[PDB]
Design a protein around this ligand. Structure first.
Ligand SMILES: CC[S@@+](C)CC[C@H](N)C(=O)O
Ligand code: SF4
Length: 245
């Protein structure tokens, strides 16, 4: 029945645990972050066609490695939530195999049909990218308003879904102190954020823009100052957050 469109899949040791995570990067994203790591995930009509059956046969070989703490599967890519029906089925097949499931998303949910709730029932962890609390800047950095992502976040809180937050720090855009406080405050109130990951801006994936003959509006911006990272981090910890930077 449901077929999925993916950019790729790779197994990888979870940043902090002995387990391995099988990560499937779903094809397609409606955002256009100036710093996008892989713009090749943008096209919703690209990638490869795979069935739930196909992915599970790829995850099995890694089974022994997923029963270790952070071991499990992750739906990432561009925006995995755009293919919410398939991810639901994938996660359902994984749940019966005794596998931990993580939904890595930007939360750019357009409509709130029941499939989302179904998806969450079989989602052990939601990794939410919060790109910018100041919508003025968010529009300029991403190309869309953060309103939907923000509603989605509140949606997850009211459901008591365990959430980790990811925030990309970029000098001149998200290094602002007023923005760190807005983020720390907002996530504090959600009440379900268990940890925040601070990622310093990186000019990686730039060859994907130039390759497709496109202009990168951040080729002149450099990573954030080691001190600046400590600044925002310290600000977020004031709201009672574990910042795993
Ligand atoms: C840039 C960090 S990645 C682990 C996630 C990139 C983007 N938010 C995505 O989920 O497609
Ligand atoms: S949400 Fe992720 S995949 Fe989509 S444009 Fe932004 S960085 Fe790229």
């Amino acid at each position: 029945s449901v077929i999925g469109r993916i950019h790729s899949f790779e197994s990888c040791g979870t940043v902090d645990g002995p387990g391995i995570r099988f990560i499937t990067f779903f094809q397609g994203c409606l955002m256009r972050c100036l710093y996008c790591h892989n713009r090749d995930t943008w096209d919703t009509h690209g990638g490869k066609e795979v069935t739930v059956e196909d992915l599970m046969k790829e995850v099995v070989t890694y089974r022994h490695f997923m029963n270790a703490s952070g071991g499990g599967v992750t739906a990432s890519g561009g925006e995995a939530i755009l293919q919410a029906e398939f991810v639901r089925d994938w996660f359902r097949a994984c749940k019966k195999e005794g596998i931990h499931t993580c939904l890595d998303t930007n939360g750019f949910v357009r409509r709130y049909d029941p499939v989302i709730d179904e998806l969450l029932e079989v989602t052990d962890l939601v990794m939410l990218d919060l790109k910018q609390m100041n919508d003025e800047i968010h529009q300029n950095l991403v190309g869309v308003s953060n309103h939907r992502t923000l509603e989605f976040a509140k949606y997850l809180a009211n459901k008591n879904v365990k959430v980790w937050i990811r925030y990309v720090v970029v000098p001149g855009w998200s290094d602002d102190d007023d923005s760190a406080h807005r983020l720390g405050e907002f996530t504090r109130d959600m009440g379900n954020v268990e940890k925040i990951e601070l990622l310093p801006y990186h000019e990686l994936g730039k060859h994907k823009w130039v390759a497709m003959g496109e202009e990168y509006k951040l080729d002149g911006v450099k990573p954030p100052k080691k001190e600046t990272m400590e600044r925002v981090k310290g600000i977020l910890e004031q709201y009672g957050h574990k910042v795993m930077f």
